[PDB]
Amino acid sequence: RTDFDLAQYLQVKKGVVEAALDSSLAIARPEKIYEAMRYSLLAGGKRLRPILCITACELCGGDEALALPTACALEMIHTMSLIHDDLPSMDNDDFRRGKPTNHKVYGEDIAILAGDGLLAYAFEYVVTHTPQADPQALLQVIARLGRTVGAAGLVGGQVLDLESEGRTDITPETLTFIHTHKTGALLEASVLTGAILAGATGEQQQRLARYAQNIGLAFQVVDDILDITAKAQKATYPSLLGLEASRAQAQSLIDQAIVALEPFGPSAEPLQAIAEYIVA
Amino acid sequence: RTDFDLAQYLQVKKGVVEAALDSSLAIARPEKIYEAMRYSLLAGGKRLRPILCITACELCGGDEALALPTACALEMIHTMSLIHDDLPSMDNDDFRRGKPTNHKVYGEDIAILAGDGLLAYAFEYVVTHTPQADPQALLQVIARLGRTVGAAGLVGGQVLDLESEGRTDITPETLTFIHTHKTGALLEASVLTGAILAGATGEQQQRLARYAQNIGLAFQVVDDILDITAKAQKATYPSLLGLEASRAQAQSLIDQAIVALEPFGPSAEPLQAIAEYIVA
Ligand SMILES: C=C(C)CCOP(=O)(O)OP(=O)(O)O
Ligand SMILES: C=C(C)CCOP(=O)(O)OP(=O)(O)O
Ligand SMILES: [Cl-]
Ligand SMILES: [Cl-]
Ligand SMILES: [Mg+2]
Ligand SMILES: [Mg+2]
Ligand SMILES: [Mg+2]
Ligand SMILES: [Mg+2]
Ligand SMILES: [Mg+2]
Ligand SMILES: [Mg+2]
Ligand SMILES: [Mg+2]
Ligand SMILES: [Mg+2]
């Protein structure tokens, strides 16, 4: 094969990642916590975040071997956030991607604990499996991951989302504020941890952060568009802006994400193709 | 003052720690997650783990400035484990150290998320606030903390404890297995992260790990002794061994913890005094 095909590029990275994730949890005593963690971690899905991490690392002159442990850690973090999000105390989903939810399968106590275990393991895994990284770079990755997950990132976003339920004062700005924390921080971490591992400059990181923020929002706008075209109220992009402006804003976010990476040269084409996919 | 007094030694370290913890969480948007985290982190208590970390770091030729960020991270981890332990899905305690429990005060959703935030912040805080550490040492601390919290440590211990409820086959060995994960891993991490920061040898670390494991078990034996002298059934040390053997085993654990540190010379006296306290 001589030409770039996104579907096949992703297929190959998804396989490498799902093999690494499988490897990463050898069942030990107590077997149940490993069964519960494996249930959610190996449940499949797009594996976008690890793939973004590997992709951004390669973009910046790193390789898959350097990025794969961080890539896994990002998926462990993503999975923990899903396990916790599904809980009766939160969304109370009985199903996820056509499969029953962790707490329905093992109980709420085990689900809460499998989430905690995956978050812990993320940090252990990055350090124990990346001895070839520059130590100052790995520590910057650890700092970034801790910042991404907590009050200033993902957990901050979950609280901002809870605070939005049954309110009549949500604006496009406050909805964007929710999404930039809830999902944007982890997408940004996914491309910036890859770049940081490869030794990327502050200037290169700022472009990747713009890309990541814009693809994150674009995903959430398109999602809202698909919802409205297909529990207290919650305002969405189309409910606040109308469908015409929602659609133009999604296109414009994807355009700015693609332009943001143009100065990396053709090495950026895979990340640009991921952005285009969101609006195809 | 010319002589060592444990009560005053602890008072001084507890003050430095509670000031650092207070400092570590400046309220920002969304204020609620910072209020919820601060509620549990600043609720007081013995601050044993941070104090052990600072103490073991000083024992090994480090200082309080080197250890304080890790010391805080250990208390953040401890607090997260308490917030999660108290949840309706777990122990369902409405109170803790005479104060209402995080989920009663903010809700289960916020409590779950404040726990996640504190666990995340632990890792961020260690890296961002310890630039003077040797980078390979800090990464070993991060690895140790991730390993301590997860399936092989604290979360493993919580699952082993859940698995013990209403069983008739618990032995002193299986009760010890629960406690070495549930509390022993984090006490061990508390003295080993301090020692690792100060550049301690593998040989010195092994003595500190023996000390930490023995003071951890001694605490749990004495606790069971005090319970039985003062929900499905749960076997305890006195219910399995009798009170005479329980008491001899607590004394013997404390003796082995003190002997384990004798080869450090008099620098070990503070850690030895902490051990003696457990049985006084
Ligand atoms: C923080 C994250 C990404 C957890 C899932 O958030 P959502 O609430 O958007 O997910 P669904 O329940 O809609 O699947
Ligand atoms: C893992 C830890 C240390 C959480 C508290 O455990 P416990 O179940 O022993 O604590 P209490 O509810 O008895 O306070
Ligand atoms: Cl460039
Ligand atoms: Cl020595
Ligand atoms: Mg949800
Ligand atoms: Mg959900
Ligand atoms: Mg939406
Ligand atoms: Mg181009
Ligand atoms: Mg308990
Ligand atoms: Mg409890
Ligand atoms: Mg007990
Ligand atoms: Mg002595």
CSV table of N, CA and C in Angstrom, one decimal, chain A residues 25-28 30-43 76 79-80 82-84 86 96 99-118, chain B residues 151 155 159 162-163:
chain,number,residue,atom,x,y,z
A,25,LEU,N,-3.1,-5.6,32.0
A,25,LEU,CA,-3.9,-6.1,33.1
A,25,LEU,C,-3.8,-7.7,33.2
A,26,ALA,N,-2.8,-8.2,33.7
A,26,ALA,CA,-2.7,-9.7,34.0
A,26,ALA,C,-3.5,-9.9,35.3
A,27,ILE,N,-4.5,-10.8,35.3
A,27,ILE,CA,-5.4,-11.1,36.5
A,27,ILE,C,-4.5,-11.7,37.6
A,28,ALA,N,-4.7,-11.1,38.8
A,28,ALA,CA,-4.0,-11.5,40.0
A,28,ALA,C,-5.0,-11.3,41.2
A,30,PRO,N,-6.7,-9.5,44.2
A,30,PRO,CA,-8.0,-10.2,44.1
A,30,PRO,C,-8.5,-10.2,42.6
A,31,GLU,N,-8.7,-11.4,42.0
A,31,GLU,CA,-9.1,-11.5,40.6
A,31,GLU,C,-10.2,-10.5,40.2
A,32,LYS,N,-11.2,-10.3,41.1
A,32,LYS,CA,-12.4,-9.5,40.8
A,32,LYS,C,-12.1,-8.1,40.3
A,33,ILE,N,-11.1,-7.5,40.9
A,33,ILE,CA,-10.8,-6.0,40.5
A,33,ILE,C,-10.2,-6.0,39.1
A,34,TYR,N,-9.4,-7.0,38.8
A,34,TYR,CA,-8.8,-7.2,37.5
A,34,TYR,C,-9.9,-7.5,36.5
A,35,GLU,N,-10.9,-8.3,36.8
A,35,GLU,CA,-12.0,-8.7,35.9
A,35,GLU,C,-12.8,-7.4,35.6
A,36,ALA,N,-13.2,-6.7,36.7
A,36,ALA,CA,-14.0,-5.5,36.6
A,36,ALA,C,-13.2,-4.4,35.7
A,37,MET,N,-11.9,-4.2,36.0
A,37,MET,CA,-11.2,-3.2,35.2
A,37,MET,C,-11.1,-3.6,33.7
A,38,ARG,N,-10.8,-4.9,33.4
A,38,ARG,CA,-10.6,-5.4,32.1
A,38,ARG,C,-12.0,-5.3,31.3
A,39,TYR,N,-13.1,-5.5,32.0
A,39,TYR,CA,-14.4,-5.5,31.4
A,39,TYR,C,-14.6,-4.2,30.7
A,40,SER,N,-14.4,-3.1,31.3
A,40,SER,CA,-14.5,-1.7,30.8
A,40,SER,C,-13.3,-1.3,29.9
A,41,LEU,N,-12.1,-1.6,30.3
A,41,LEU,CA,-10.9,-1.2,29.5
A,41,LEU,C,-10.9,-1.9,28.1
A,42,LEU,N,-11.3,-3.1,28.0
A,42,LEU,CA,-11.2,-3.9,26.8
A,42,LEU,C,-12.5,-4.0,26.0
A,43,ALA,N,-13.5,-3.2,26.4
A,43,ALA,CA,-14.9,-3.2,25.8
A,43,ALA,C,-14.9,-2.7,24.4
A,76,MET,N,-7.0,4.4,30.0
A,76,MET,CA,-7.3,4.0,31.3
A,76,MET,C,-8.1,5.1,32.0
A,79,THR,N,-11.6,5.4,30.4
A,79,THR,CA,-12.4,4.3,30.9
A,79,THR,C,-12.9,4.6,32.3
A,80,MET,N,-12.0,5.0,33.2
A,80,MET,CA,-12.3,5.4,34.6
A,80,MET,C,-13.5,6.4,34.6
A,82,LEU,N,-15.7,7.0,32.3
A,82,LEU,CA,-16.9,6.4,31.8
A,82,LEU,C,-17.5,5.5,32.9
A,83,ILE,N,-16.7,4.7,33.6
A,83,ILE,CA,-17.3,3.8,34.7
A,83,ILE,C,-18.0,4.7,35.7
A,84,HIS,N,-17.3,5.8,36.2
A,84,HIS,CA,-17.8,6.7,37.2
A,84,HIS,C,-19.0,7.5,36.6
A,86,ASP,N,-21.3,6.5,34.5
A,86,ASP,CA,-22.5,5.6,34.3
A,86,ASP,C,-23.2,5.4,35.6
A,96,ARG,N,-23.9,0.6,27.8
A,96,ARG,CA,-22.9,1.4,27.2
A,96,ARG,C,-22.3,0.7,25.9
A,99,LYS,N,-23.3,-2.8,25.4
A,99,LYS,CA,-22.9,-3.8,26.5
A,99,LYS,C,-23.4,-3.2,27.8
A,100,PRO,N,-23.8,-4.1,28.8
A,100,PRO,CA,-24.1,-3.6,30.2
A,100,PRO,C,-23.0,-2.8,30.9
A,101,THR,N,-23.4,-1.9,31.8
A,101,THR,CA,-22.4,-1.0,32.4
A,101,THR,C,-21.8,-1.7,33.6
A,102,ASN,N,-20.6,-1.2,33.9
A,102,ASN,CA,-19.6,-1.9,34.8
A,102,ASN,C,-20.4,-2.2,36.1
A,103,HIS,N,-21.1,-1.3,36.7
A,103,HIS,CA,-21.8,-1.4,38.0
A,103,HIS,C,-23.0,-2.4,37.9
A,104,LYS,N,-23.6,-2.6,36.7
A,104,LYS,CA,-24.7,-3.6,36.5
A,104,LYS,C,-24.1,-5.0,36.6
A,105,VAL,N,-22.8,-5.1,36.1
A,105,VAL,CA,-22.1,-6.4,35.9
A,105,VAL,C,-21.4,-6.9,37.2
A,106,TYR,N,-20.9,-5.9,38.0
A,106,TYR,CA,-20.0,-6.3,39.2
A,106,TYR,C,-20.6,-5.6,40.5
A,107,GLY,N,-21.4,-4.6,40.4
A,107,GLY,CA,-21.9,-3.9,41.5
A,107,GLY,C,-21.3,-2.5,41.5
A,108,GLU,N,-22.0,-1.6,42.3
A,108,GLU,CA,-21.6,-0.1,42.3
A,108,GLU,C,-20.2,0.0,43.1
A,109,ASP,N,-20.0,-0.8,44.1
A,109,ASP,CA,-18.8,-0.8,45.0
A,109,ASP,C,-17.6,-1.2,44.1
A,110,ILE,N,-17.7,-2.3,43.4
A,110,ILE,CA,-16.6,-2.8,42.5
A,110,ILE,C,-16.4,-1.8,41.4
A,111,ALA,N,-17.5,-1.2,40.8
A,111,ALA,CA,-17.4,-0.3,39.7
A,111,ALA,C,-16.6,1.0,40.1
A,112,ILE,N,-16.9,1.5,41.3
A,112,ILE,CA,-16.3,2.7,41.8
A,112,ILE,C,-14.8,2.4,42.0
A,113,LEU,N,-14.5,1.2,42.5
A,113,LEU,CA,-13.1,0.8,42.9
A,113,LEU,C,-12.3,0.5,41.6
A,114,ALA,N,-13.0,-0.1,40.5
A,114,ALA,CA,-12.3,-0.4,39.3
A,114,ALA,C,-11.9,0.9,38.6
A,115,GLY,N,-12.7,1.9,38.7
A,115,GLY,CA,-12.4,3.3,38.2
A,115,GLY,C,-11.2,3.8,38.9
A,116,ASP,N,-11.2,3.8,40.2
A,116,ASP,CA,-10.0,4.2,41.0
A,116,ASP,C,-8.8,3.5,40.6
A,117,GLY,N,-8.9,2.2,40.4
A,117,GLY,CA,-7.7,1.3,40.1
A,117,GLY,C,-7.1,1.7,38.7
A,118,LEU,N,-8.0,2.0,37.8
A,118,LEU,CA,-7.6,2.4,36.4
A,118,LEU,C,-6.9,3.8,36.5
B,151,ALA,N,-4.9,-1.9,42.2
B,151,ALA,CA,-5.3,-3.2,42.4
B,151,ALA,C,-4.4,-4.0,43.3
B,155,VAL,N,-6.9,-0.2,46.6
B,155,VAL,CA,-8.1,-0.6,45.9
B,155,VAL,C,-8.2,-2.2,46.0
B,159,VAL,N,-11.4,-4.3,47.9
B,159,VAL,CA,-12.1,-5.5,47.3
B,159,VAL,C,-11.9,-6.7,48.2
B,162,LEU,N,-14.3,-6.3,51.1
B,162,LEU,CA,-15.7,-6.6,50.7
B,162,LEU,C,-15.9,-8.1,50.6
B,163,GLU,N,-14.9,-8.8,50.0
B,163,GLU,CA,-15.0,-10.3,49.8
B,163,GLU,C,-15.0,-11.0,51.1
